[PDB]
Chains A and B, each alone.
With several copies, the nearest count.
Chain A
C-alpha cells in the first residue's frame, strides 16, 4: 500500500499530506523506495541492477557509494568482473544475503524520503547487519527520511523509535520498546517465547 501498488479500500494514505495517486509515477517511486521480502534481480550487470529505473544514469561513484552503504561493495569488488558481472535471470549467482544487499543498494541509490525494509535483514550476514544498523540509527542521512522497518530481528526493533504489533490485520499495541515490555502484552510474549 505504501508503494502505491494497491489502493486502500477505506481510510486514506497520505504522503506529505496528499494522496499517493496525486504524485507523478516516477517521482513517487524514486521518493519511496522499498526492499522486498524476496527481492527481484534482473538479468543484467550489477551496475545496471543497482541503478534500475533512474532517468539519469548514475556515475560509478554514486553506485559504489550506495554499495558501500548497503555492504554490497565487499563481495561485488571481489567478483572477477566487478560491477560488470552479468547476473543470471533468477539471480542464482548471488547467494542469499548478497541479493538483499544489492536490493538495498538499489533502494538507497535513489536517496528516498521513505525507506521500506520488508524482512530485509533475514539473509544479511554480520557485516551487512552492522551496516544496516549504522544506516538506520547512526547515518547522518537518517534525518532526511523515514524508515518502515518490517522485520523479526529484535536487535533492530529494540532501538526502533516506534513499534507497532500488527496482529491479524490490526495494531494490537504500540509505543517504544520499554512501554511494550512494561505492558507485558503480545510483544512481551513474542520476545520471551523462545525463553519459555
Chain B
C-alpha cells in the first residue's frame, strides 16, 4: 500500500513539474534545487495528510535531493562550463530508476548502520595502560623512524636494478648498494626496538590486569564466593586477562602505520583528481556496515567461548581437587567424559567463530575486487573522454587502492581490538564490583574488655534470604567466663560464630563489642582481637610456621613454639622431617585430622585474642587431648565461646546457651 501510493504521488508530482509548473522555475542548478524542494514538500504534505510518513519519510529527502545535489558536486569538481543540467521529471526513466536504487541502497546501509560499552571498556583499558606511557612513546618514535627509512630504501633498490639492467657503472652500483644497506639497517634496528617495546608493554598490561583482578576478588563479600565457582574465577583470571592484552604488538603497529600513511595518500590522490577521489569513497559505507555486523557476531561468540572455557576449567578443578574421592569410587572415566563434553562445546564455539571470520574475509575480498573494477571502469571512461592521461590514471589507481586497503585494515583492526576487549567483560565487572559489606571501620582501641552482646539479632543468608537462620537471638559474653553454645545440626551455631567475627551482617538487631557495633572496628584489629578455631580447619600449603602465624606480619619463633606447646601440637611437630618448617601440603593434606585441629588451635592462640570462638574445636581430637584442652583456654581476661554439638565437656562452663532452629531457649 504505502509504496504504491508513494510511487503514484511521485509520478503525479513529476508530471506536474514537467508541465507549466516547470516553466516558471529557473534553469540550471537553482532550477534543479527548487524542483527538488517542491518535490519534497509535495511528498511530505501528501504523506502527512494520508498518515503514511511513519516509515517512508526517511526515504523522502534522499530520493528528492539525490539528483540535484549530485549535479552540484559535479559542477563543483568537473566545472560548470558544461551544458545546464536537465530537470528530474524531464530526464528519462533510467535516471529515476537509478535514483530509486540509490535511495533504497542508502536506506538499507543506514538500517544496517543504525557500542558505548565497548568504548567505556576500551577507555578503562587505556587507564590501566597509562603507567606504560614511556614505552608507548618510545615505540611510536621507533615506528616513525622505521617508516621514514622504508620510504628511502626503494629509491636505492631501484637504482641498483636500473644499473644492473642498463649500463653497469661500478661506482654507482657500489654507492646504491651502500645506501640501500644503510637505510635497511637503520629501519630494521628501529623496527626491532619498536616490537620489543610493544611486547613488553603487552606483558606489563597483562600482569597489571591479573594483579588488579585478584586484589579486587579478595575484597568481595562471602556471598560472592558462594554464588561463584573457584575454577571459573581462575579461568577468568588466566584467560580473559590474556584476551584483554593479546593484540597490542601487531594491531597497534598496523593501526599506527595506516594512520601515518592514509592522510598523505589522500592528499596525493586529491592532487591528481578530486573527482575520482570523491568517487573512491564508495567503499566506506559497505566496509563499515560489514564490519559492524561481523563485530557484533564476533563479540557474542567470544563471550560464549570464554564461558565454555570457564565451565571446562571448573570440571578440571573439581576432578583434580577431589582426586582421592573420585578415585575411591572408580569415577575417573566419568570425569574424563564430562571434560570431553565441555571441550566439545568449546570446539563447536571455536568452529563457529572461525567460520564466520573466514566468511567475512571472503565477503570483504569480493567487495574490494568489485569496487576496484568499478573505479577502473570510471577512470578508463574519464581517460577516453580526455579528462586525465594514462600516467595520472595509473598513479591515482595505485594511490586509491592503497588507501582502500589502509582504511579496510584500520576498520578491521579497530573492531578486532574492541571485540577482544569487550569479550572480557566479566574481568572488568569483577574489578568494578562493589562488595556488599559495610564501610570499613576505624576503631583500634588499645584496651579491649571483650564484652560481646547480641541484641535481637536476626540473620538470613543473602544467598537464600527467604529462609531465616537466627530469630531474635540476644545474649551477653563476659570476659573471664565461659559460654557454651549447644544445639543440634542446622541450629545456627556457626552462623552465630560468623556474625561474631563480622563475616556477615545481621539483618536485624546488633552485635556489639565493648558497647559499639563490631562493624565499626578496623579489619585487622578486629580479626586480631576476635579469633576462631573453625569446625573443619583449613590450612594452606607452606611451612607449619606460616600456618601457625598466618596473617601476622612479624611473629617471632618463640611465640610460634609457645603456641604449639599450648595447643599440644609440639608433640607431633618435632617428629616431622624439619620441625616447624615442614611443608603441610595443600589444605594440610599431609597431616592427620587431629594434627590439623591442633595446628589450627595453635594458630588461633598465637594472637593472644581477647575473644576466642572454639567452633567444634575438639571434634576430631582424641580423648586425651580433649580432656587436656578442657577449660584452660580462659585466663580471667579472655572471653570464650565454646560451640558444641551436645553437652560434651561443656558443663564446666559458667553460662550455657541452648539454640534450636535459630531460637534461643532459656535454662
Direct contact of A and B (CB under 8 A): yes
Measuring CB to CB, which residues of chain A are less than 8 angstroms from any residue of chain B? 3, 5, 25-30, 34, 36-40, 42-43, 52-53, 75, 88-89, 92, 95-98, 119, 122-123, 125-126, 152, 190, 193-194
**Chain A residues whose CB sits within 8 angstroms of the CB of B318 once the complex forms:** 42-43, 89
State whether the Cβ of B18 lies closer than 8 Å to any Cβ in chain A. no
Binds A, one of B171-179, B328-336, B375-383, B472-480: B328-336
Considering only CB atoms, which chain A residue lies closest to B334 in the complex?
A: A53
**Chain A residues whose CB sits within 8 angstroms of the CB of B230 once the complex forms:** 89
Within 474-492 of B, Cβ neighbours of A (below 8 Å) are at 488-490
**What are 6 A-to-B residue pairs whose CB atoms are below 8 Å?**
A29-B327, A37-B620, A38-B593, A43-B314, A96-B536, A97-B645
Mask of B490-529 contacts with A, CB within 8 angstroms, 1/0: 1000100000000000000000000000000000000000
**Chain B residues whose CB sits within 8 angstroms of the CB of A96 once the complex forms:** 489, 535-536, 616
Measuring CB to CB, which residues of chain B are less than 8 angstroms from any residue of chain A? 226, 229-230, 314, 318, 322, 324-331, 333-334, 488-490, 494, 535-536, 593, 616, 619-620, 622-624, 627, 645, 649
**Chain A residues whose CB sits within 8 angstroms of the CB of B616 once the complex forms:** 96
Nearest-neighbour CB distance to chain A for B483, whole angstroms, equals: 20
**Chain A residues whose CB sits within 8 angstroms of the CB of B324 once the complex forms:** 5, 36, 40
**Chain A residues whose CB sits within 8 angstroms of the CB of B229 once the complex forms:** 43, 89
Contact at B623–A75, with CB atoms within 8 Å? no
Contact at A28–B330, with CB atoms within 8 Å? yes
Contact at B329–A29, with CB atoms within 8 Å? yes
Considering only CB atoms, which chain A residue lies closest to B492 in the complex?
A: A95
**Chain B residues whose CB sits within 8 angstroms of the CB of A89 once the complex forms:** 229-230, 318
Contact at A29–B627, with CB atoms within 8 Å? no
Contact at A88–B226, with CB atoms within 8 Å? yes
Known contacts A42-B322, A97-B489, A123-B489; can you find 5 more A-B pairs with CB under 8 A? A36-B324, A36-B328, A42-B318, A53-B334, A75-B490
Choose one: A52, A75, A123; the contact of B331 (CB below 8 Å).
A52
Contact at B325–A40, with CB atoms within 8 Å? yes
Contact at B490–A37, with CB atoms within 8 Å? no
Contact at B489–A37, with CB atoms within 8 Å? no
Contact at B489–A29, with CB atoms within 8 Å? no
- B contact patch SS: loop
Considering only CB atoms, which chain A residue lies closest to B621 in the complex?
A: A152
Given A95-B490, A98-B490: A30 and B627 interface contact (C-beta under 8 Å): no
Choose one: B325, B330, B334, B620; the contact of A119 (CB below 8 Å).
B620
Contact at A53–B329, with CB atoms within 8 Å? yes
**Chain B residues whose CB sits within 8 angstroms of the CB of A97 once the complex forms:** 489, 645
**Chain A residues whose CB sits within 8 angstroms of the CB of B623 once the complex forms:** 152, 190, 193-194
**Chain A residues whose CB sits within 8 angstroms of the CB of B328 once the complex forms:** 3, 5, 29, 34, 36
Which of B326, B490, B616 counts the most A-chain CB atoms under 10 A from its CB? B490
Nearest-neighbour CB distance to chain B for A84, whole angstroms, equals: 15
Considering only CB atoms, which chain A residue lies closest to B623 in the complex?
A: A193
Nearest-neighbour CB distance to chain A for B335, whole angstroms, equals: 10
**Chain B residues whose CB sits within 8 angstroms of the CB of A34 once the complex forms:** 328
Contact at B490–A53, with CB atoms within 8 Å? no
**Chain B residues whose CB sits within 8 angstroms of the CB of A30 once the complex forms:** 329-330
Given A98-B489, A119-B593: A25 and B330 interface contact (C-beta under 8 Å): yes
Which of B230, B331, B649 counts the most A-chain CB atoms under 10 A from its CB? B331
**Chain A residues whose CB sits within 8 angstroms of the CB of B536 once the complex forms:** 38, 96
Contact at A37–B593, with CB atoms within 8 Å? yes
Choose one: A25, A39, A125, A152; the contact of B489 (CB below 8 Å).
A125
Nearest-neighbour CB distance to chain B for A192, whole angstroms, equals: 10
Contact at A194–B627, with CB atoms within 8 Å? yes
Which of A95, A98, A193 counts the most B-chain CB atoms under 10 A from its CB? A95
Contact at B645–A125, with CB atoms within 8 Å? yes
Given A42-B318, A95-B494, A98-B489: A53 and B226 interface contact (C-beta under 8 Å): no
**Chain A residues whose CB sits within 8 angstroms of the CB of B327 once the complex forms:** 5, 29
Choose one: B330, B489, B627; the contact of A95 (CB below 8 Å).
B489
**Chain B residues whose CB sits within 8 angstroms of the CB of A88 once the complex forms:** 226
Given A95-B490, A97-B489: A53 and B620 interface contact (C-beta under 8 Å): no
6 A-B pairs with least C-beta separation: A53-B329, A29-B330, A53-B331, A26-B330, A97-B489, A40-B325
**Chain B residues whose CB sits within 8 angstroms of the CB of A126 once the complex forms:** 488
**Chain A residues whose CB sits within 8 angstroms of the CB of B333 once the complex forms:** 26
Nearest-neighbour CB distance to chain B for A73, whole angstroms, equals: 15
Contact at B322–A193, with CB atoms within 8 Å? no
Considering only CB atoms, which chain A residue lies closest to B491 in the complex?
A: A95
**Chain A residues whose CB sits within 8 angstroms of the CB of B622 once the complex forms:** 152
Considering only CB atoms, which chain A residue lies closest to B317 in the complex?
A: A89
Nearest-neighbour CB distance to chain A for B467, whole angstroms, equals: 8
Which of A3, A37, A119, A194 counts the most B-chain CB atoms under 10 A from its CB? A194
Considering only CB atoms, which chain B residue lies closest to A110 in the complex?
A: B329
Contact at B490–A92, with CB atoms within 8 Å? no
Which of A27, A53, A152 counts the most B-chain CB atoms under 10 A from its CB? A53
Contact at B329–A52, with CB atoms within 8 Å? yes
**Chain B residues whose CB sits within 8 angstroms of the CB of A53 once the complex forms:** 326, 329-331, 334
**Chain A residues whose CB sits within 8 angstroms of the CB of B331 once the complex forms:** 52-53
Nearest-neighbour CB distance to chain A for B81, whole angstroms, equals: 81
Nearest-neighbour CB distance to chain B for A53, whole angstroms, equals: 3
**Chain B residues whose CB sits within 8 angstroms of the CB of A123 once the complex forms:** 489, 619, 645
**Chain B residues whose CB sits within 8 angstroms of the CB of A98 once the complex forms:** 489-490
**Chain B residues whose CB sits within 8 angstroms of the CB of A194 once the complex forms:** 623, 627, 649
Nearest-neighbour CB distance to chain A for B165, whole angstroms, equals: 74
**Chain B residues whose CB sits within 8 angstroms of the CB of A119 once the complex forms:** 593, 620
